[PDB]
Amino acid sequence: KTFEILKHLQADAIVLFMKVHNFHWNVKGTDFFNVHKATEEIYEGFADMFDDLAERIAQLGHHPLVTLSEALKLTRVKEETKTSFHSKDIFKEILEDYKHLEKEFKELSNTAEKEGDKVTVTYADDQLAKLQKSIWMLQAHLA
Amino acid sequence: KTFEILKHLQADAIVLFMKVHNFHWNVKGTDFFNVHKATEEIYEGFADMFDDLAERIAQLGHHPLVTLSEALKLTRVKEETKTSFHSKDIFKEILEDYKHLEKEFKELSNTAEKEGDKVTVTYADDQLAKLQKSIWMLQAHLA
Amino acid sequence: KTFEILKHLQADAIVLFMKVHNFHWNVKGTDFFNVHKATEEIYEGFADMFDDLAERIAQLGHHPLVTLSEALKLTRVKEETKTSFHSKDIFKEILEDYKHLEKEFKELSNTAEKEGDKVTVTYADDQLAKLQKSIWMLQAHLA
Amino acid sequence: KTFEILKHLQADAIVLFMKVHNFHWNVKGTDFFNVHKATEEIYEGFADMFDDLAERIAQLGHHPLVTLSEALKLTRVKEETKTSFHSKDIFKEILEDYKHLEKEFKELSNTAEKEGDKVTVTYADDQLAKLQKSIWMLQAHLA
Amino acid sequence: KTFEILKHLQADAIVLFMKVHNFHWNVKGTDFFNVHKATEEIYEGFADMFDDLAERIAQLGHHPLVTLSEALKLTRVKEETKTSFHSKDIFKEILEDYKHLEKEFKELSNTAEKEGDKVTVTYADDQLAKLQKSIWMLQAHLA
Amino acid sequence: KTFEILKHLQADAIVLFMKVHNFHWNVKGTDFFNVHKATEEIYEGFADMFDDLAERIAQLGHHPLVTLSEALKLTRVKEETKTSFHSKDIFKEILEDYKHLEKEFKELSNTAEKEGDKVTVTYADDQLAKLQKSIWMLQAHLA
Amino acid sequence: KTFEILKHLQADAIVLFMKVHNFHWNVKGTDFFNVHKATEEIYEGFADMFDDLAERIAQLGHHPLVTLSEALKLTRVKEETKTSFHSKDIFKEILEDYKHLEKEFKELSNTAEKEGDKVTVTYADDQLAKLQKSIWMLQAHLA
Amino acid sequence: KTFEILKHLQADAIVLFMKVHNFHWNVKGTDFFNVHKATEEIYEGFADMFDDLAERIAQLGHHPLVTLSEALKLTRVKEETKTSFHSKDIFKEILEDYKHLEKEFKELSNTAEKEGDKVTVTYADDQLAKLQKSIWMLQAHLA
Amino acid sequence: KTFEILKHLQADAIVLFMKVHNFHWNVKGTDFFNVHKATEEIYEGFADMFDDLAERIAQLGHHPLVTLSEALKLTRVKEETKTSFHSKDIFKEILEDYKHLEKEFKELSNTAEKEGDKVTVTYADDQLAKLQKSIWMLQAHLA
Amino acid sequence: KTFEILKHLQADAIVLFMKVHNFHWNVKGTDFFNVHKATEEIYEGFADMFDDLAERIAQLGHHPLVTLSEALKLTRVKEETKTSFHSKDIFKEILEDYKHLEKEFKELSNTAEKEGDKVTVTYADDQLAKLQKSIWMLQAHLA
Amino acid sequence: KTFEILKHLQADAIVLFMKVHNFHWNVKGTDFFNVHKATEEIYEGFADMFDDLAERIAQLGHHPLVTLSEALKLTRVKEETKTSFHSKDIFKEILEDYKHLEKEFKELSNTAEKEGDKVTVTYADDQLAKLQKSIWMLQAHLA
Amino acid sequence: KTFEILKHLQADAIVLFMKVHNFHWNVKGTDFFNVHKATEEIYEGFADMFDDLAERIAQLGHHPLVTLSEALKLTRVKEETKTSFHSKDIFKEILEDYKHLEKEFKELSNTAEKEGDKVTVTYADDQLAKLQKSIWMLQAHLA
Ligand SMILES: [Zn+2]
Ligand SMILES: [Zn+2]
Ligand SMILES: [Zn+2]
Ligand SMILES: [Zn+2]
Ligand SMILES: [Zn+2]
Ligand SMILES: [Zn+2]
Ligand SMILES: [Zn+2]
Ligand SMILES: [Zn+2]
Ligand SMILES: [Zn+2]
Ligand SMILES: [Zn+2]
Ligand SMILES: [Zn+2]
Ligand SMILES: [Zn+2]
Ligand SMILES: [Zn+2]
Ligand SMILES: [Zn+2]
Ligand SMILES: [Zn+2]
Ligand SMILES: [Zn+2]
Ligand SMILES: [Zn+2]
Ligand SMILES: [Zn+2]
Ligand SMILES: [Zn+2]
Ligand SMILES: [Zn+2]
Ligand SMILES: [Zn+2]
Ligand SMILES: [Zn+2]
Ligand SMILES: [Zn+2]
Ligand SMILES: [Zn+2]
Ligand SMILES: [Zn+2]
Ligand SMILES: [Zn+2]
Ligand SMILES: [Zn+2]
Ligand SMILES: [Zn+2]
Ligand SMILES: [Zn+2]
Ligand SMILES: [Zn+2]
Ligand SMILES: [Zn+2]
Ligand SMILES: [Zn+2]
Ligand SMILES: [Zn+2]
Ligand SMILES: [Zn+2]
Ligand SMILES: [Zn+2]
Ligand SMILES: [Zn+2]
Ligand SMILES: [Zn+2]
Ligand SMILES: [Zn+2]
Ligand SMILES: [Zn+2]
Ligand SMILES: [Zn+2]
Ligand SMILES: [Zn+2]
Ligand SMILES: [Zn+2]
Ligand SMILES: [Zn+2]
Ligand SMILES: [Zn+2]
Ligand SMILES: [Zn+2]
Ligand SMILES: [Zn+2]
Ligand SMILES: [Zn+2]
Ligand SMILES: [Zn+2]
Ligand SMILES: [Zn+2]
Ligand SMILES: [Zn+2]
Ligand SMILES: [Zn+2]
Ligand SMILES: [Zn+2]
Ligand SMILES: [Zn+2]
Ligand SMILES: [Zn+2]
Ligand SMILES: [Zn+2]
Ligand SMILES: [Zn+2]
Ligand SMILES: [Zn+2]
Ligand SMILES: [Zn+2]
Ligand SMILES: [Zn+2]
Ligand SMILES: [Zn+2]
Ligand SMILES: [Zn+2]
Ligand SMILES: [Zn+2]
Ligand SMILES: [Zn+2]
Ligand SMILES: [Zn+2]
Ligand SMILES: [Zn+2]
Ligand SMILES: [Zn+2]
Ligand SMILES: [Zn+2]
Ligand SMILES: [Zn+2]
Ligand SMILES: [Zn+2]
Ligand SMILES: [Zn+2]
Ligand SMILES: [Zn+2]
Ligand SMILES: [Zn+2]
Ligand SMILES: [Zn+2]
Ligand SMILES: [Zn+2]
Ligand SMILES: [Zn+2]
Ligand SMILES: [Zn+2]
Incomplete structure (x- = not known):
């Protein structure tokens, strides 16, 4: 069901909102500004994705999830519990989760x-685009 | 300890980020636009509070929390699991949580x-202000 | 035929442009500003829809309709001949016509x-979105 | 009566809104962009005139017209049912209707x-100005 | 005398500047934001009216009034000494004072x-317009 | 005749455009920036007045003047042939010419x-305003 | 009591709003523009101070003053009843009242x-800053 | 194969970037500004199309073309080697190439x-739109 | 002498300011808007050239000319006394005067x-550029 | 001959437009964003250089080149046929071509x-500047 | 004494203004743009700090320092006399001086x-914040 | 040598940056705002001149100066050690130093x-311009 996948993705969006803030605060290296600013753009994107998925759910006559609780559940x-990173580790993690969202979209x-x-x-299809x-750009960072 | 209260507040900020989105999606009544737009301003404020508290924690040589898990724990x-509201219920809830944050700040x-x-x-003191x-404005809504 | 539905929709767009101006001028109640401004956004949207449908028709090698006469005919x-409303009546009417446009799109x-x-x-599909x-938001006003 | 002339003019405004869109879509010749953009400015002016006349009527304690039906009647x-023009034909028509509005204002x-x-x-007097x-500029186009 | 009416109106402008701030601070009800923002626009308008009337007086070779004292006198x-309102009471009061300014202009x-x-x-005539x-819009709020 | 006065004023506008540039270049004293910038605003106003008067003339079916020659004639x-001023002399001259334009308008x-x-x-009446x-402000400079 | 001083200051703010407009309209000398514009910035500052003090009072659970009457009383x-000034007199007066507000803040x-x-x-402390x-700048004007 | 058509189109984009600059520099007639500005918009569009096609190719795990050499080859x-045009010739050429891109998209x-x-x-489908x-607008120029 | 040529050019600038306004008001043909707007850009350029030449003269320790009288003399x-034009006549005249300014610069x-x-x-050299x-663009209009 | 060097440079500009896009798409490493954005600024500069050189050629009474064909020839x-780079290789290549353009300018x-x-x-001389x-900045990257 | 520390800090601000420009001009490595732009933001901050400290000194009835001479003395x-750096050396130096300013504030x-x-x-306290x-961000660069 | 004069001028730029701030803080008289704002524009210009001269030096393969020490030396x-001025004294000093920079440029x-x-x-030549x-404007202040 469409609304079931929407809910799942909504859950990932808020989880990545948090995860990406981790990378935002805890990156180390002469890379700091670039990753600090880029992660800020990434989590702001996820905040919008979260809202948009929730609002598609509502539009469709269903209920988006309304607690962090359901998010962690879905x-x-x-x-990510670790609190220190090189930029390469951040990009690998973000890439992984992106590949996950790509499959799901x-x-x-x-x-x-x-x-x-x-x-x-x-x-x-807009989100896939x-x-x-980003998947291409991240692959290019890591190559 | 200063950083302990910071962490606690950081946890509330992300929880209210979610809670306020609930109110954003699930308000009912001829009040809809106003509450929809106002809740959007409120959760955007909470997203900044979250980031700022986390970044004060880091500055202070400690670790902000990095999972929704710790947030729910702290x-x-x-x-709010309910998924339908009149504007008055939204304002009462937001007021309650505001009074909580006021005490803590x-x-x-x-x-x-x-x-x-x-x-x-x-x-x-800036956040108290x-x-x-908002506490005054919300009291005025409800009076 | 695609261009036949386009023409039909073009006719509704200019008719709703007018109908929505009625609601714009003739709403009553402590609701006045919000409905006055929102109806202004709605009719401006319909003016663009009108132009865009007409221009798709032309692109497709056909003739868009060029008189209010054909619009009323198609x-x-x-x-709406009535000249006084509560906001709830305006939202019910707009909702009805929206459900009509949704079906047709x-x-x-x-x-x-x-x-x-x-x-x-x-x-x-862009217009459906x-x-x-809006259908969801209007349903939420009326609930 | 003032409000009677207002109503008449309101009717012309919405009719010219449509008529001018005809010229917008159906002009032919190496003149296309200029006339396409200029007609867009003209019909946007007429949309405002329409709204303003209606709102003066309401202010004056009367009812503006609320259907395309009354507009065609008043x-x-x-x-214009024709669907192809040289720019000169568009300017002649617009000039004619302008001279009509001038007299009425x-x-x-x-x-x-x-x-x-x-x-x-x-x-x-503002609208006359x-x-x-425009009458002068259109006369200059045609000379 | 022209300058005598100007002075009178200048006095009302500064008095309404204050009166409207009362409504700005002391409105109650789920109506709060809208009335809070609208009253802010209203008193800012009155601050400009005040300045403009004073400056017409000066232009005309006379002296505008220069104390709150003369304002209360003229x-x-x-x-309004009361310190709590529903929006309807605010609109009724503002309407009354508007009808007064209309007569005087x-x-x-x-x-x-x-x-x-x-x-x-x-x-x-610009101020009458x-x-x-506003008189029409306020009548529409109250109807 | 209306168009005769228009032409006369058009002639003054271009003459003052030049005269004011004199003051712009040739003011002396610790007053320099203020008078340099203010004269720039004044001559830019006169450039618009010139264009607007000419365009009213054309609108009215007559011919605006098209040479500096006719301007000096009308x-x-x-x-002003002198090439050095204190600000007070500039304001006195501008005031004089303003009083002239006021009478004519x-x-x-x-x-x-x-x-x-x-x-x-x-x-x-707009230009009189x-x-x-400006007459009031200039009188205030000189007092 | 905090709210008592707030009220007192609120009263001064609206009184200075008026007083400063006096200086705005009635300054004389080649100094006119600078003082006219600067007084405009000053009274706009006082309009905000007025609103902010009133709103702190409300926040604190008390009632700001709501009439010019109480303002003159508190x-x-x-x-200032006089209606003509050199810039030096304006700066001396404003300086005096500033020193008063400084003490009170x-x-x-x-x-x-x-x-x-x-x-x-x-x-x-923000207002003191x-x-x-301004006290320093005004002292520098007068030195 | 998708990436094969992408590459082909990428080649046309850079070729049209150049071709359109020819028209930009070498148009003749009282039509000059309009065609000069419009061709500038057209080639800027083609510069973006070029970049976007290349970047889709990369995203898809393939290599976009990287020399003018391959572009001319694909x-x-x-x-266009000619160096002088009337606007009608420019529009006919651009129309032809547009019809080509339409087919390919x-x-x-x-x-x-x-x-x-x-x-x-x-x-x-976005590029087709x-x-x-443009095809419609160009047909309208030439009719 | 440098300042002698500057003065000469200053005289042409104000004369062309007027001449170009003639073309601005008195162009005829379906060309009207384009020439009306372009002439407006041209005369605004000449107003700046005028000011800049005058200000170079002053900088150089000499006196720019300060009357329309000297301008016509230098x-x-x-x-141009004629009061009606086709766009081609306007471009030929402007081209001629441009070739004159080019030589002089x-x-x-x-x-x-x-x-x-x-x-x-x-x-x-900046003005030559x-x-x-413009000479090239005008040649292209006329070809 | 001046126009011969212009043509040569015009040819390099369009070739570098392409070459720089290669670097834009095919850079690898944690350096990706910075080089991706910087190359975008570089090729946009080259697009303007191309247009400007061509337009100087036209101004000078000659014909700029109008095909990629002549560009590759001149x-x-x-x-660059290779399709993968570290940032250092990109900077070395760009530096080389810059030194070439410097000599030619x-x-x-x-x-x-x-x-x-x-x-x-x-x-x-403007382009040399x-x-x-850029030569200095690139030398500093590579040092 | 407060004003003594202010003066000391004012001296550091202008010295760091210069020192930071050194880093701005003389950084080496693929890091160049980021450090070039960041140092520009840093020295612009120091220019404001300098001005603000000086202006607090004046406000307080004392004299800020007015020569580079006193700055070097206080x-x-x-x-830094060296003229070549890797980004890491720049960050270490800036960090050191920051820790110094932190202590002093x-x-x-x-x-x-x-x-x-x-x-x-x-x-x-604002400057400490x-x-x-920055201390945290710089520590994160170097970790 | 070119780079020797560049260095000398770079030294003056930072010295004037400071000197002009003196005038910024320590001007006295009803002239205060104008001189305060104008000196701010002047020192901001000098900050850019400083940076630009330094960067030309680097470009030229030499080392700009990197300490206040060398600046005072070159x-x-x-x-200026004095700490109080009338505007006339400030303009005389600035004029003197300007005449010095003019000679050197x-x-x-x-x-x-x-x-x-x-x-x-x-x-x-750009800096000379x-x-x-400014030399002309300052001469005009003092005349
Ligand atoms: Zn998932
Ligand atoms: Zn941050
Ligand atoms: Zn952002
Ligand atoms: Zn939302
Ligand atoms: Zn750690
Ligand atoms: Zn590490
Ligand atoms: Zn808490
Ligand atoms: Zn929404
Ligand atoms: Zn928002
Ligand atoms: Zn952050
Ligand atoms: Zn439900
Ligand atoms: Zn309900
Ligand atoms: Zn339908
Ligand atoms: Zn309205
Ligand atoms: Zn709108
Ligand atoms: Zn359209
Ligand atoms: Zn009715
Ligand atoms: Zn009712
Ligand atoms: Zn789409
Ligand atoms: Zn009519
Ligand atoms: Zn269109
Ligand atoms: Zn438009
Ligand atoms: Zn309206
Ligand atoms: Zn047809
Ligand atoms: Zn035809
Ligand atoms: Zn008017
Ligand atoms: Zn009254
Ligand atoms: Zn407020
Ligand atoms: Zn406002
Ligand atoms: Zn005013
Ligand atoms: Zn109460
Ligand atoms: Zn109540
Ligand atoms: Zn006259
Ligand atoms: Zn100037
Ligand atoms: Zn200006
Ligand atoms: Zn004009
Ligand atoms: Zn002289
Ligand atoms: Zn003198
Ligand atoms: Zn007090
Ligand atoms: Zn004013
Ligand atoms: Zn202001
Ligand atoms: Zn307020
Ligand atoms: Zn008086
Ligand atoms: Zn006096
Ligand atoms: Zn193809
Ligand atoms: Zn061009
Ligand atoms: Zn463009
Ligand atoms: Zn790209
Ligand atoms: Zn040729
Ligand atoms: Zn031809
Ligand atoms: Zn000449
Ligand atoms: Zn015009
Ligand atoms: Zn313009
Ligand atoms: Zn000037
Ligand atoms: Zn004629
Ligand atoms: Zn003709
Ligand atoms: Zn070359
Ligand atoms: Zn990209
Ligand atoms: Zn860009
Ligand atoms: Zn171009
Ligand atoms: Zn590869
Ligand atoms: Zn590698
Ligand atoms: Zn220190
Ligand atoms: Zn730089
Ligand atoms: Zn900056
Ligand atoms: Zn300052
Ligand atoms: Zn070195
Ligand atoms: Zn190294
Ligand atoms: Zn603070
Ligand atoms: Zn020197
Ligand atoms: Zn300051
Ligand atoms: Zn500034
Ligand atoms: Zn720099
Ligand atoms: Zn002193
Ligand atoms: Zn003195
Ligand atoms: Zn130059």
């Missing part, structure tokens, strides 16, 4: 096509 | 004065 | 997919 | 002076 | 026409 | 009322 | 520290 | 649907 | 190099 | 001085 | 509390 | 022409 994103898109929910398709652009 | 904010301020951490004082302005 | 939107989208007119699809967001 | 503007102004409605006078500037 | 506006306009002071006429727009 | 403004306004040219009236504001 | 600011700050009202302290900057 | 766009879109590359579809709008 | 620009530049006035050289760009 | 810039400048083409001199600033 | 900042703050100079306290944020 | 600018320009350093010439404009 997410497939590993929270594809699923979201495929599922919504099947159920004749075209709006959810164009939302999912962004994820694939 | 918060004194009740998450006072504590933060008092404690930091004692430990000779003046920066943390001016941060705490905002909380007391 | 529309399924009831004009779905048709437009489905029909254009069939005829291999992909541009018209992405236009129709907006209509479904 | 207008002295010929709708003079009447509006004279009538409002008589009835001691000074606000309506300053509104009418604009019409006479 | 005003026909009742100061008409007088100002008529008197200035007689004395051949055309500048003061166009100033008075604004007062009549 | 102006009642004394050109009154004439323009009166004459246009008589001939039923309302647009030219509202133009003349500006001239009387 | 102020220690002498109103110190009192406000000291008193609020005692009562544990930290928000009011940071407000009072501004007053001491 | 393009189906005829370079359709192919791109169809092919990407087949291979399950949804991002490339939404990119191709723009090409069909 | 200019080699023919004033070359002279200015050469002369200033000789006298070791480098500032005047860089001013003259602009004149040669 | 350039002394080696195209000197030649351009010297040659134009000889032929009395001062405009082309000030253009060449930029090239020498 | 500073505890070592000037604490002293300033403590001393001003003692002397009842609250304005100087809030200034000192900034220094501690 | 400058021909007298530092001429030398810089002449020397750079000789050594074939054209970039340094265009930099020197500014110095001669």
